[PDB]
């Protein structure tokens, strides 16, 4: 403080003062209610409010938003992946169709036609012209006895061996090689005591064991 | 009024005009040109320096992480329904395993055991009630060789109508209801040496058309 300039004392000391001997009030808490002065009405223009602004709280988070999309997208991925076109031509009868053709159904029809000609060979008279008429004139035979009965009978057997090839390459079947037994005695009683066809007929079902057992046989698969 | 005599020089005016700029070109390098710094002498302190900082580092990069979580997690959710291993799913004839037990394979064996009893009934002694009526055989043997009757043959047909119910319970595609014709003439030629027995045998394959035609809901038509 300079006396030559007459500096003036600011009001900073009155604010920093700690003691106080000027207040002459009998009470500042009980009298505050007498005038109806409560903090409730002051809390409206004095109490703080609620301020909260977040960008992730309102805006959608692309991070978690991706996990919510794959939820149904992935669940439907393998679901629709199982269905490609919407049709099953195999019908559980020719799975080889996917890697072949599936003649099992079609060829099944041509077989019913030729399978009958075997016994109907006598009902169908030969009317087509033959080219062996001049070859018989050289031998000239007069004794032409009838001898047709076992030739077409045994023919029904080889007719199945030649068909085992087109079917052998069908695909991979593992039905039942152990069941081949229950099917054996099944034909034994079907035969009679006199002529037993099961003796030579067994060789026909036995060959089926190879085509079916084909499920696993690298020993003869080169 | 004449300050051109050489009065004192006031400094208040020196502050008004105290700006200068020897360099007027746009390039400010002319200021350092006065030093003549060389690149070689400066390359000596060219050790550490020349670098940058990543901006995405401060930002989180786990956004796509939430998408990869449900990516494979949900992809397997539906896969568990079908099965990852898949042991004997169809095997070519096990499609009923999902809507049945698969008696077509096993039950097929019990049929070979009873299907033979039909003809074997003559090879073994019957157990019909009434041993007195057989007094003719107990008194003496008279003609007891092989003999196929028709009263026992018709029983082979009544056994196929009672077994179709256990199989019809499953129901399957008609496969080829149009092929039923190509199979008819195939049996007509199978016999041609007198009275064709296929005449009555047709009723047997005819019932098969109903089991296979089952492919469509019977209520849709009736």
């Amino acid at each position: 403080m300079s006396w030559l300039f007459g500096d003036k004392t600011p009001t900073d000391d009155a604010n920093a003062a700690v003691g106080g001997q000027d207040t002459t009030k009998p009470k500042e808490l009980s009298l505050k209610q007498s005038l109806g002065f409560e903090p409730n009405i002051n809390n409206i223009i004095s109490g703080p409010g609620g301020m909260h602004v977040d960008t992730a709280r309102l805006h959608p988070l692309a991070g978690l938003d991706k996990g919510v999309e794959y939820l149904d997208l992935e669940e439907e991925q393998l679901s629709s992946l199982e269905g490609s076109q919407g049709l099953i031509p195999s019908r559980g009868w020719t799975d080889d169709l996917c890697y072949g053709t599936g003649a099992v159904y079609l060829l099944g029809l041509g077989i019913g036609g030729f399978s009958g000609m075997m016994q109907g060979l006598q009902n169908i008279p030969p009317n087509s012209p033959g080219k062996l008429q001049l070859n018989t004139v050289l031998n000239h035979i007069t004794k032409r006895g009838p001898f047709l009965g076992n030739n077409a009978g045994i023919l029904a057997l080889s007719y199945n061996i030649i068909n085992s090839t087109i079917d052998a390459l069908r695909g991979k079947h593992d039905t039942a090689g152990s069941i081949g037994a229950g099917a054996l005695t099944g034909a034994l009683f079907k035969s009679s005591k006199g002529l037993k066809p099961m003796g030579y007929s067994s060789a026909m079902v036995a060959a089926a064991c190879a085509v079916w057992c084909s499920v696993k046989k690298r020993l003869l698969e080169k | 009024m004449s300050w051109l005599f050489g009065d004192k020089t006031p400094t208040d005016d020196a502050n008004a005009a105290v700006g200068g700029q020897d360099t007027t070109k746009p390039k400010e390098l002319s200021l350092k040109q006065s030093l003549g710094f060389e690149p070689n002498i400066n390359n000596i302190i060219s050790g550490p320096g020349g670098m940058h900082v990543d901006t995405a580092r401060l930002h989180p990069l786990a956004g796509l992480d939430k998408g990869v979580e449900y990516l494979d997690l949900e992809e397997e959710q539906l896969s568990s329904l079908e099965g990852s291993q898949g042991l004997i799913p169809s095997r070519g004839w096990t499609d009923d395993l999902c809507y049945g037990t698969g008696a077509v394979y096993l039950l097929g064996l019990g049929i070979g055991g009873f299907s033979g009893m039909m003809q074997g009934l003559q090879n073994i002694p019957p157990n019909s009630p009434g041993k007195l009526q057989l007094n003719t055989v107990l008194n003496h043997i008279t003609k007891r060789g092989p003999f196929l009757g028709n009263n026992a043959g018709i029983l082979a047909l009544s056994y196929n109508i009672i077994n179709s119910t256990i199989d019809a319970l499953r129901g399957k595609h008609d496969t080829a209801g149009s092929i039923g014709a190509g199979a008819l003439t195939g049996a007509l030629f199978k016999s041609s040496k007198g009275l064709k027995p296929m005449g009555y045998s047709s009723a047997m394959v005819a019932a098969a058309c109903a089991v296979w035609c089952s492919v469509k809901k019977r209520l849709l038509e009736k």
Partner: peptide
């Protein structure tokens, strides 16, 4: 064969993409 779904929600297939795991929700 047993392979027939029921009712499909539009079409949105997707080839195999990514193959790792970190968090779980």
């Amino acid at each position: 064969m047993l392979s027939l779904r029921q009712s499909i929600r539009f079409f949105k297939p997707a080839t195999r993409t990514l193959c790792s795991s970190r968090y779980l929700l």
